[PDB]
C-alpha cells in the first residue's frame, strides 16, 4: 500500500525539482544576458 | 553582544581563492585613488594563563580559528556538525598532509 | 574649450550610466535568484 | 523489500536539499561583493 | 598640458579597468552558480 503512496510522493515532488531546476536553469544566462551589453563599453570607455 | 554558535552554522560564507579578490581591489581602489592623484594572540594566550593557572591545550585551539560546517544525515534527516580545527592535522585543518580529498570521482 | 570639454563628455556620459546599468543587474539577480530559494522551500513544502 | 528502499531514498533526497539550501543561499551574497565595490568606482 | 594629460590618464586607466572586473565576475559567479544546478538535478539522481 505505502509503495504506491511513496511513488506518488516521488513522482509529484520529482517534477517540483525540475520546476525549481528550470527555475534556476534560467539563472546561468542572466548576466550573460545582462552585462555582456555592459561589457561593450570596456574597450570603448 | 553574547556569543551565538548558530550564527556560524547559518553564516553565508567560506574560504575562497581570493587571489582575484586582491586584484579586484587594486583596480577598485586606484580609481578613486587616481581621481585624487608579542602579537595580540600571545596576550590572549597569556590572558587564560593568568585566569587559568594552566595551559589547557583544549583551550588553545579554541582561541584559534575553528571551522564549523553544518551537515545533514541522510538516515535521520537530522544534523551533525563536521568540524576541523585550525591546527588540526585531520581533514579541513590548515596543517594537513597531501594528497587531500578530491571530488574528481564524485563531481563527474 | 571644446577640445578638452568634449573629450570629457565621452567619459562623463559613461561614468554616470554604468551606475543605472549595475543597479538594475543586482535587483535583476536578487529577483531572479530569490526565486531559487523560494522554489526550493516549495519542494520541501511538497516533501 | 521494495518499500524500504523506496522509503529510504525519500528521506535521503530531501536531506541534500537542505545541504543545497545553504548552497543556493550563497549566490545572493555572492552578487553584492562582486558588484557593490564596482559602484563607487564609476560614481 | 601636463596638468590635464596626466590627469586625463586617470580616467583612461580608471573607466576601462573598472569594466574589466565585470568579465571575471561573469566568469566566476556563473561558473560557480552552475554547481547548484548540478546538485539539484543530482538530488533527483538520488531517487
TrEMBL record, chain B:
Transmembrane segments: none annotated. It comes from the Viruses. This is UL17. It comes from Human herpesvirus 2 (HHV-2). The chain holds residues 227 to 422 of 702 of the full protein.
From TrEMBL, chains C, E:
It comes from Human herpesvirus 2. It comes from the Viruses. This is Large tegument protein.
From TrEMBL, chain D:
This is DNA packaging tegument protein. The gene is UL25.
